[PDB]
């Protein structure tokens, strides 16, 4: 009898990367947009340096494929992803550039805003009260 | 026509039921017997007037026969809790929230009412949501408040 020979592999329901859960049925691109700090654009960048076919689903990936992606997230600058692609450029505290993942984002924004408030930076005071800081008009819109 | 709005059910651990006097209602014209194409919001705070300067809470023209339709809410509340909440009047095993007075229309359905609960322990549960006609809450002292068979 004939056989299909074009079927996906036996698939797992969901998997863990980053203290984050990824739906195994979801195709790798929109699936890596679950981890904070991996947007659409950067998700495609990582996958083509780890060299994984974009059309596989997240639950088909081996441990090996998940290590390849895990390695590229901890150190993008090693696999020729240039610094203008990354979250945190010319860090005031370190001089360096780095890519913040998961809960690091909120923690870094907090420690930053808190420092400005300790010394009375007007920009930080407004964000704490729920006000706007990019010059937007606050009379007509943005109520409640 | 006059309609009483009751809150019916089995009440446990409840001191008072409070009701927002805001009713999404289906109305039928008493002239041409046609149902209004959309539900209308009937609110106690809506101020309208008949063509004889009588206060009403809703004034709607029938789209088919052009007849005017009017509804007045009479709150049956015995008191205002925190000057905001209409305490429904307890009547045996139910609560009388309001009386709706229709002229030129029938009220066919009240869809929903926003309900708040005051427990026997003096705790307020605002904007309670029923699941399949049931609501239940427990406090930090293990006192239960519940409503079962809500209608």
């Amino acid at each position: 009898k004939l056989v299909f020979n074009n079927n996906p592999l036996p698939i797992q329901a969901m998997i863990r990367m980053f203290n984050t859960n990824i739906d195994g049925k979801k195709q790798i691109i929109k699936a890596l947009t679950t981890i904070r700090g991996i947007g659409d654009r950067l998700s495609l960048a990582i996958l083509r340096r780890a060299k994984i076919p974009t059309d596989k689903r997240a639950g088909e990936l081996t441990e090996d494929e998940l290590n390849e992606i895990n390695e590229v997230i901890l150190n993008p600058q090693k696999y020729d992803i240039p610094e203008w692609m990354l979250n945190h450029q010319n860090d005031p505290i370190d001089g360096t550039t780095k890519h913040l993942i998961g809960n690091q984002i909120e923690g870094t924004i907090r420690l930053w805003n808190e420092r400005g408030k300790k010394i009375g930076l007007v920009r930080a005071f407004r964000t704490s009260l729920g006000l706007k800081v990019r010059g937007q008009r606050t009379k007509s819109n943005g109520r409640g | 026509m006059k309609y009483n709005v009751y809150i019916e059910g089995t009440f446990s651990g409840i001191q008072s039921i409070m009701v927002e006097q805001v009713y999404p209602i289906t109305i039928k014209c008493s002239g041409c017997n046609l149902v209004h194409k959309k539900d209308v919001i009937l609110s106690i705070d809506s101020i309208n007037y008949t063509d004889k300067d009588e206060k009403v809470n809703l004034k709607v023209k029938c789209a088919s026969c052009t007849r005017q339709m009017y509804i007045l809410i009479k709150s049956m509340a015995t008191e205002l809790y925190e000057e905001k909440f209409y305490c429904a009047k307890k009547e045996d095993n139910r609560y009388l929230a309001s009386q709706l007075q229709g002229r030129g229309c029938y009220i066919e359905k009240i869809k929903d009412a926003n309900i708040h609960v005051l427990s026997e322990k003096g705790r307020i549960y605002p904007d309670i949501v029923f699941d399949e006609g049931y609501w239940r809450e427990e406090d930090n002292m293990n006192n239960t408040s519940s409503i079962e068979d809500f209608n």
Partner: protein
């Protein structure tokens, strides 16, 4: 505990650098202001700061320096000084602490009182 640092540089080194060198650290819009050269007003303000840091000795505070140079970025030469910045109505006083580097003097003063209805 570690020394104060701005974009990699220690306060000891930072207080010794020329304005031309400090320019390699600052944000883009602040750099463009220093590349386009100082006004005659700004030069007097800066020369007074350099004089003051030099002149002051012991435990007595130097006198306040007032300015309407609102857009000037804060420089490592006015650290520890008391400076009055014009608010459109009055010279609002402040002390220039280390953590203010990389910002303009207008960022620390309100020209409009906060609103509470």
């Amino acid at each position: 505990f570690k020394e104060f640092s701005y974009k990699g540089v220690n306060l000891e080194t930072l207080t010794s650098m020329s304005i031309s060198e400090f320019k390699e650290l600052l944000p883009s819009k602040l750099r463009r202001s220093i590349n386009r050269g100082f006004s005659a007003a700004e030069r007097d303000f800066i020369k007074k700061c350099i004089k003051a840091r030099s002149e002051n000795t012991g435990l007595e505070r130097p006198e306040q320096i007032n300015t309407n140079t609102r857009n000037l970025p804060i420089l490592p030469t006015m650290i520890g000084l008391q400076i009055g910045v014009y608010s459109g109505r009055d010279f609002m006083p402040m002390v220039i602490k280390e953590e203010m580097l990389g910002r303009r003097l207008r960022d620390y003063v309100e020209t409009r009182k906060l609103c509470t209805h």
